Design a binder for these strands. Sequence first.
RNA 1: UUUUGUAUAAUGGGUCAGCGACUUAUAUUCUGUAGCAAGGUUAACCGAAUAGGGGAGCCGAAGGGAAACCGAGUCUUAACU
RNA 2: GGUUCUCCCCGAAAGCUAUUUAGGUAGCGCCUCGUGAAUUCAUCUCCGGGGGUAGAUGCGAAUACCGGAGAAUGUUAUCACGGGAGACACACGGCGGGUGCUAACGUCCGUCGUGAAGAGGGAAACAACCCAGACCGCCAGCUAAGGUCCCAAAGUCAUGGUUAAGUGGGAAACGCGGAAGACGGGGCUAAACCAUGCACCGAAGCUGCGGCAGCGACGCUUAUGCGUUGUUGGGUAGGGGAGCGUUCUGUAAGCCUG
RNA 3: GAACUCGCUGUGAAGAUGCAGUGUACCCGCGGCAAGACGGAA
Lengths: 117, 141, 235, 58
Amino acid sequence: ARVKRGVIARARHKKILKQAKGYYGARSRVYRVAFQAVIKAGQYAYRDRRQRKRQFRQLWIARINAAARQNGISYSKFINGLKKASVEIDRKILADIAVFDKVAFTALVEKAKAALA
Amino acid sequence: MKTFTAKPETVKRDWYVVDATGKTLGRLATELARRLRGKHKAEYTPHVDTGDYIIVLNADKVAVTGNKRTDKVYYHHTGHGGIKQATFEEMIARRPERVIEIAVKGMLPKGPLGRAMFRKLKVYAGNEHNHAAQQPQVLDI
Amino acid sequence: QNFITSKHNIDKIMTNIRLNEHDNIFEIGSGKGHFTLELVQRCNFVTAIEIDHKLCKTTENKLVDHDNFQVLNKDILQFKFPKNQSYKIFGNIPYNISTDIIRKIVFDSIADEIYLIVEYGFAKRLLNTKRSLALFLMAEVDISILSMVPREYFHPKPKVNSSLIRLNRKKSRISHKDKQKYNYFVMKWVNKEYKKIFTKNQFNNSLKHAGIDDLNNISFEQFLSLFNSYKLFNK
Amino acid sequence: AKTIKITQTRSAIGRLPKHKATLLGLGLRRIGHTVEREDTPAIRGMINAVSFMVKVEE
RNA sequence: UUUUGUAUAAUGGGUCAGCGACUUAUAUUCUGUAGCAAGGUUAACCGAAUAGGGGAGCCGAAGGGAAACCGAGUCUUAACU
RNA sequence: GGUUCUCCCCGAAAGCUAUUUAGGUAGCGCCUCGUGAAUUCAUCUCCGGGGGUAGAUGCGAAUACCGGAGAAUGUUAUCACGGGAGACACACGGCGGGUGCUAACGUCCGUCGUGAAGAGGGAAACAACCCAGACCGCCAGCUAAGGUCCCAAAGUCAUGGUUAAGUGGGAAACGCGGAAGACGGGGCUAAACCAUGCACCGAAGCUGCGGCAGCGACGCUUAUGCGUUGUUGGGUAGGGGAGCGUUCUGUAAGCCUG
RNA sequence: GAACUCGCUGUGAAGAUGCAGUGUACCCGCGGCAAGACGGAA
Ligand SMILES: *CCN(CC[C@H](N)C(=O)O)C[C@H]1O[C@@H](n2cnc3c(N)ncnc32)[C@H](O)[C@@H]1O
């Protein structure tokens, strides 16, 4: 029972070659390097899925410090006063109301400064 | 929902005037590089600059603490060859403002965005500036 | 190998060595003991280094009547020399590991009196002021040639003649307060990038102050005058 | 008698097998894992067996 | 790919499509499953031929001492606890 | 030298003893699947000790062992048999004994950690250096090693001293007295060193939410399926289990299809 | 094998276009030279 294997190998090659569209030159035309390109892209995605949570937290911390420095109080003392005042607001939406609001951030800074002093 | 980002065609930047008579070199250059990057604004984003234009005058009166006026040495290579070596005193006596610029070039990031940020700084060696039409503001540092 | 007695093809080499009865002698490579048998007699105390143990038993069989010596079964390039007191080096070495001894005795040893026998080509090249190795070699120790030993004396016949080198410590005054520019100077000198060490004016003036008329034939005191010129030009 | 809180504060990477067997007999698995014990001289022997790695609370 | 281990200073691939590598027969041991059960099972051959006949043979239900011979025990052990 | 589809569990070694033994052979030690068994085994404490390691090497502790008793913890982690292999030139460092001149960032035996078969963070880069074992997803929080002037996330923070040398910004003998190539850059007189205290940044470590998978103990029950409940899930060679796809044959003078 | 194929400092299975720091360099050609590299063993 001889079986020809023309359809299966062509479908397997076309499945991989469809995942490598938009690559420079011979990395998007031949199979022997598109396989390695797909593997390396998957590994880089798997690492950057962890790196994204560090990058966005660093951006939020920089924005929080830049917004809090205008009212005459550093980032560390502001966070320590907020923790001593028992406020459970996280770094993302606090930076969001720091960007998109000014009176509420001023009231929050005054509350933290009153709680620390 | 996504966090806010700063569009480059809608942000606002102002003008400031910084005096440099008797101020320390590094302790002024650090503040200038921090203000040029846009790190003092709530809309700070790393991939697009948001800094303000800064005019520095009286740049030949900058003082350095210690004995660095005779032993601080600047080297420069032509890219071939021979090297050009100078000290502080003949460099301020020849071209003063370059020294301040060199300090800013030591502190800003590298790449196209670094020189794009460095373009915003204008340093004058005298006391008169011709940018009075832009209506600058006096900043104390 | 290249060992041999021939007895009278020896005393004749055993004259120039002006050794006295109070010297401490370290000898590199004994063979069968044609030299150590009088090295125990003409000096005070001998500490020989030999790695071939059957040759060591041959040496003990030749030297049953001597007590002021010991033999160490240690490898030459792994042996660490004593760092106190004073002694002299005598050497009859194999050639196919010759460089491996010489940087051992000028950079990892503090011996001041060196008697070695090498081949003609090595003795000729070691005094050549072009190679970087030789420029490192006379950095601390003066080099001199005594006489020639042709090849008919070594039983396994060699192909080229041999020669005696006598090397003396000159106190150098190139040390930790002077160095880390000397390797710079020679390693930029032997491959000819003069622009990284001098400009045109200082190079021409140092040549006219030194008195060098041909760059291909430069002597050592000329080289230290050049290094002094570089030191005065570079603070 | 009086109950004792036991807390692990550092890991067991590159330690002797005696310390690992002590942790196995104590009932500690990871950093921050608290456990309850009763007062016994044997328990105090386990405590002084590894004093730099666990934390006691009376 | 070889090495304890490699961008290293050890080797191989220009690209695409097709072809290309644990199989067969006979003995032997073990595992899962099905029929029968102190019994199981046929070969060559005959045969309107996957039906039926053919018990010629093969494995087991009782052992060990070389042995004669002894036995649910025997055998060896001077003989056993 | 090569050997072609996928997933789920467990997962090592480069050692030992003997030989017409020199590229060898036979057992033991390491791994996995099936069966049974003794409160089987491990850590700790106590008890009088088999030897001779404090106090006082003449008696003899902790640490290299052995014996009994006992509480707690540990998915039997313990032993025997049968089926199936892999490995048989390891590398670096540590502890207790040797060698070498306690010569020399010198060399051998029993034992351990890291890689081989381990991802991440820090020391600029860097296999053995310090912390720390990756089921998957989240634009949530707390921490270890290391840091808080700009490059680059966080104290130009507080208290009391030291240095004037750019020492800091590298170490070997002791000469402000030989110490001098290795701050990453800018550049600093505190943004260097010592001591104290209070915060913060800081990983794939821990916690918060959702989902899948294996092995246990519970109630209904039963083609053994649900509902609580603890617990685990990096991995080369190797062992075990569950599946996808291609050709032909019976079901098939059936089904779809100008 | 695929390339969008620069110079110095240091780490290096030990002479780095790809590593960390720093500097220079608008895109593309055309006639040369030997230095890198292939022939060469310093
Ligand atoms: C492989 C050849 N050697 C030596 C051969 C000899 N130089 C010749 O005539 O070809 C070359 C290497 O040895 C060095 N070298 C130069 N001169 C000598 C002498 N006299 N003795 C030993 N070695 C020598 C060369 O620089 C080269 O490294």
